[PDB]
């Protein structure tokens, strides 16, 4: 009755975004045509700093990607992203 995963990338500015389309094209290879292997998302989450456990990326996908695609986009990546800091939660 609110979504939170809305506004996080509603707060991304089109400037913001792009910071990460240069690094996430840095692990698209298939998935579809512009997704990455959710075993990507961890180099891919420290290479701007981000150092999160692979442990609970893995947890999370399986919750995002309920077809278990094993890849994600720019649409479902930025919501793990903005989960993972902190800040209008």
């Known amino acids: 009755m609110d979504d939170i995963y809305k506004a996080a990338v509603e707060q991304l500015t089109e400037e913001q975004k792009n910071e990460f389309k240069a690094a996430f094209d ?17 180099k891919v989450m420290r290479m701007l700093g981000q150092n999160p456990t692979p442990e609970e990326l893995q947890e999370m996908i399986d919750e995002v990607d309920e077809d278990g695609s094993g890849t994600v986009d720019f649409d479902e990546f930025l919501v793990m992203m903005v989960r993972c800091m902190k800040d209008d939660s």
């Open 26 to 42: 840095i692990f698209v290879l298939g998935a579809e045509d512009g997704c990455i292997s959710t075993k990507e998302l961890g």
